[PDB]
C-alpha cells in the first residue's frame, strides 16, 4: 500500500541520515548491496546510489580478474612451447570465461551478448543440426565444432 511504502521510505531516510564508517573503509565502496523487493529501485534514492556504488565495484573487480588470468595464461603458454595444445587449454578456458563475465554482466541496454569462445554459435549449430535431422532435409549450416579457439 501507499502507507507501507511511505513508512519504508522514512526508515531508509533515517538509516542513511545516521550512518557512519571509519577504519580504512570507504563509503561508496560497500561490502554488500542492500537487498530489496522494490518495484523500480529508483523509488528509494539512497538504495539506488548504494547499489550503484556496489555495481561499479563489481565491474572494476571483474576487469582486474581478467588481467590476472591473462598473465597466468601467458606464463603457461610461453613455458609450454609447442606443447601448449594439450597443456594450457584449462587456463585458456578460465580466461575466456572471466572475459565473458566481465563483458556480459551489467552490459548496458544495447550491446549484444559477447561470446569469447564462439560457444553460443556452436551451441546453435548443434541445435540446428538436430532440428534438420528431424526435418529430414540437408543442413544449410556448418557442422558444430568441438573447440573453436585455444580455450573453448
Amino acid at each position: 500500500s501507499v502507507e507501507e511504502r511511505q513508512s519504508f521510505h522514512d526508515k531508509v531516510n533515517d538509516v542513511f541520515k545516521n550512518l557512519t564508517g571509519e577504519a580504512g573503509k570507504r563509503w561508496a565502496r560497500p561490502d554488500e548491496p542492500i537487498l530489496h523487493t522494490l518495484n523500480d529501485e529508483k523509488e528509494e534514492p539512497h538504495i539506488f546510489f548504494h547499489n550503484t556504488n556496489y555495481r561499479t565495484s563489481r565491474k572494476y573487480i571483474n576487469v582486474e580478474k581478467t588481467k590476472i588470468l591473462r598473465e597466468q595464461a601467458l606464463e603457461c603458454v610461453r613455458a609450454a612451447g609447442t606443447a601448449r595444445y594439450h597443456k594450457c587449454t584449462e587456463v585458456m578456458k578460465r580466461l575466456q570465461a572471466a572475459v565473458r563475465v566481465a563483458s556480459n554482466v551489467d552490459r548496458g541496454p544495447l550491446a549484444r551478448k559477447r561470446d569469447v569462445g564462439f560457444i553460443y554459435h556452436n551451441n546453435r549449430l548443434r541445435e540446428l543440426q538436430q532440428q534438420a535431422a528431424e526435418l529430414e532435409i540437408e543442413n544449410p549450416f556448418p557442422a558444430p565444432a568441438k573447440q573453436a579457439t585455444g580455450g573453448y
Partner: protein, 546 residues
C-alpha cells in the same frame, strides 16, 4: 643485447633529425648512422643464434602499459621468438648495407642527414613491428613504416609526381589499414586478448581471415593493391631497396605467417593471380627500376600461395621472404650503380658494354639475378623450389591451377631478368655518359649482401632445406628447364607482332586508368553533391528581406 636491436636505429634517426645534427653536419651524421646500424645488426645476430638455434624465446616488458580500458588491454611489451628473430636478422642486416650505400649515393644531396635519419626511423619502426607481442604495438609499427614510406617516397618534394606517388601509397594502404583494424576488432572480441600467444584459432567467423588478408594485401602489394608499388620508384634508390627488401612489403606476409588464421582459397587465388600478373607486367617494361619492382610483386605472390598451403608452407613462406630480401636489395643497389654510371638514365635501351660500371656492380647484378631465377644451388633455388614442390602435392584442387601459374611465372621471371642483364651489359653501347662508380662504401654494401646470399646456401633458414618431398624427376627438374627457356628466349631477343597484346600488357592492363574513374572521380563528384546541393542547397536556410 635484446633491446639493442629495436631501440638503437630509432636512436640513430632521432640523432640525425634533431638539432644535434646541426653540430655534426653531413660528415658526422654519416658516421653516426653507420655505427648505429652496426650495433643493431650485432645485437640481431646474437638474438638469431640464441632463439633460432638454441630455442630460447625472450619476453620483455619495455614501457609498462600503453592503455587499458575495460577488457581492452594494450601493453608496451615485446616477445622475441623464432619468427621475430628471423625478421630482425633480415631487417637489420639489409638496412646496414643500405645505410652504408646511402651515405655515398646521396652525398651530393643538400639535406643528407635528414635522409639518413628518415632511413633509420623507417628501419626502427620495422623492428618495432616485428618485435611486438600484441596487435596494437604491431599497429604502431605498421603505421610508422607507412608514414616513413610517405616521407621517403616524396623526398624530392619539388617534383610533383613524387609527391603524388607518396600520397598514392598512403591512400592505397589506408584502405587496407581500415580493413585490418576491423579485423583486429573481430579477433579481440571473439578471443578476449591481443597477445599473439593467446590467439589460437581453429574455426572463426570468416570476416577475421578475410579482413586481415585485405590488410595484408595492402602492404604486400597484391592484386588490386599493387598500384602504389610501381609509382614508389619516384624516391631515391636506397628507399626502393629498403622498401622492396626488408621493410613494408614483407610486413603483410609476416602478419599472415604469424597469425595463420586465413582461409586458403582466397590466399591461393590472390597469390597466384598476383604472381602471373606481375610476371607479365615486368616482361614488358623498359624502366630499369620498374622491372625489379614488378619482380618483387611476383615473389610476394609466391610467398602468399606458400602460406596458403599450410604450416610447412608457412615456414617455406618465411624462408622465401628471408632469402628474397638479400638478393632483392642487391639487385636494387646494383641497378642504382648502373644508373649513376650512365648519367641518371633509367631506360634499358640506352645501356650496353662494360665501361659504365665497376666489375663488382656487374658481378652483384649477375649473382643476385642468378639467385632470383632459381639457378641450382644458389640461395633462391632452395626456397623457390620448396614452394613449387609443396604446391605440386597439395590436395586442394585450387592449388592445381596455382602451380601452373607459378611455373609460367618462373619462365617469365627468367626471361625479363636475363633481359635486364643482356640490355645492361651484353649489347653495344647506346648511351652518352660514362662515369663509372668505384667508391669503397657502395662496393662493400654490395659485398655484404652477396655474403648473405652465400650464407643462406651454407646455413639454411629452417629445417626444410634438404628434406625431400618425393616427386618424379620430370616434375622436379621442370623449373630448371623453364629457367633455361627464359634465358634462351631473352638472349635471342625475339619479339612478337601482336602489338595490341604488347600494348595491353606494357600499359599494365590499365589498372591505374580504370581506377582514375571508377572510385576516384565519383568520390570527387559525390563531394560536389554533398557540398553544393546539400549544404548550400537543400539544407540551407535563407534570409528574410525587409
Amino acid at each position: 643485447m635484446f633491446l639493442l636491436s629495436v631501440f638503437f636505429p630509432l636512436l640513430g634517426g632521432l640523432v640525425n633529425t634533431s638539432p644535434i645534427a646541426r653540430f655534426l653536419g653531413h660528415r658526422g651524421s654519416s658516421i653516426i648512422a653507420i655505427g648505429c646500424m652496426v650495433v643493431a645488426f650485432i645485437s640481431s645476430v646474437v638474438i638469431y643464434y640464441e632463439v633460432v638455434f638454441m630455442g630460447c624465446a625472450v619476453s620483455v616488458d619495455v614501457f609498462g602499459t600503453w592503455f587499458s580500458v575495460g577488457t581492452f588491454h594494450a601493453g608496451w611489451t615485446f616477445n622475441f621468438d623464432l619468427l621475430t628473430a628471423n625478421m630482425l636478422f633480415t631487417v637489420t642486416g639489409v638496412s646496414m648495407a643500405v645505410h652504408m650505400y646511402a651515405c655515398d649515393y646521396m652525398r651530393q644531396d643538400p639535406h643528407l642527414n635528414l635522409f639518413l635519419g628518415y632511413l633509420s626511423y623507417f628501419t626502427g619502426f620495422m623492428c618495432v613491428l616485428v618485435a611486438a607481442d600484441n596487435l596494437l604495438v604491431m599497429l604502431v609499427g605498421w603505421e610508422g613504416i607507412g608514414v616513413c614510406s610517405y616521407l621517403l617516397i616524396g623526398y624530392w618534394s619539388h617534383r610533383l609526381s613524387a609527391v603524388k606517388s607518396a600520397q598514392k601509397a598512403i591512400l592505397v594502404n589506408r584502405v587496407s589499414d581500415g580493413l585490418l583494424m576491423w579485423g583486429v576488432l573481430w579477433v579481440w572480441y571473439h578471443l578476449g586478448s591481443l597477445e599473439y600467444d593467446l590467439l589460437n584459432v581453429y574455426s572463426a567467423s570468416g570476416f577475421v581471415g578475410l579482413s586481415i588478408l585485405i590488410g595484408a594485401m595492402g602492404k604486400s602489394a597484391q592484386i588490386l593493391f599493387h598500384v602504389w608499388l610501381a609509382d614508389a620508384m619516384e624516391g631515391p634508390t636506397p628507399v626502393s631497396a629498403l622498401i622492396h627488401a626488408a621493410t613494408l612489403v614483407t610486413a603483410g606476409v609476416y602478419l599472415l605467417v604469424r597469425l595463420h588464421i586465413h582461409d586458403e582459397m582466397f590466399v591461393i587465388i590472390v597469390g597466384s593471380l598476383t604472381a602471373f600478373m606481375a610476371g607479365v607486367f615486368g616482361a614488358t617494361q623498359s624502366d630499369l627500376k620498374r622491372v625489379i619492382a614488378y619482380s618483387t610483386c611476383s615473389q610476394l605472390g609466391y610467398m602468399m600461395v606458400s602460406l596458403g598451403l599450410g604450416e610447412t608452407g608457412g615456414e617455406a613462406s618465411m624462408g622465401h621472404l628471408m632469402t628474397h630480401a638479400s638478393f632483392k636489395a642487391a639487385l636494387f643497389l646494383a641497378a642504382g650503380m648502373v644508373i649513376s654510371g650512365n648519367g641518371g638514365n633509367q631506360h634499358i635501351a640506352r645501356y650496353g658494354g662494360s665501361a659504365h660500371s665497376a666489375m663488382f656492380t656487374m658481378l652483384t647484378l649477375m649473382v643476385a639475378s642468378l639467385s632470383l631465377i632459381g639457378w641450382p644451388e644458389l640461395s633462391g633455388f632452395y626456397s623457390k623450389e620448396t614452394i613449387l614442390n609443396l604446391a605440386a602435392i597439395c590436395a586442394d584442387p585450387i592449388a592445381d591451377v596455382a602451380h601452373t601459374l607459378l611455373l609460367l611465372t618462373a619462365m617469365l621471371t627468367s626471361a625479363y631478368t636475363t633481359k635486364l642483364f643482356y640490355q645492361c651489359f651484353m649489347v653495344d653501347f647506346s648511351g652518352s655518359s660514362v662515369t663509372p662508380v668505384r667508391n669503397v662504401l657502395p662496393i662493400l654494401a654490395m659485398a655484404i649482401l652477396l655474403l648473405d646470399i652465400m650464407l643462406k646456401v651454407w646455413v639454411g633458414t629452417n629445417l626444410l632445406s634438404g628434406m625431400l618431398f618425393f616427386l618424379p624427376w620430370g616434375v622436379k627438374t621442370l623449373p630448371f628447364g623453364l629457367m633455361v627457356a627464359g634465358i634462351l628466349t631473352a638472349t635471342a631477343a625475339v619479339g612478337s607482332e601482336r602489338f595490341t597484346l604488347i600494348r595491353f600488357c606494357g600499359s599494365r592492363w590499365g589498372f591505374d586508368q580504370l581506377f582514375a574513374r571508377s572510385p576516384v572521380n565519383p568520390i570527387f563528384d559525390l563531394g560536389r553533391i554533398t557540398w553544393a546541393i546539400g549544404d548550400r542547397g537543400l539544407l540551407s536556410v535563407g534570409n528574410l528581406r525587409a
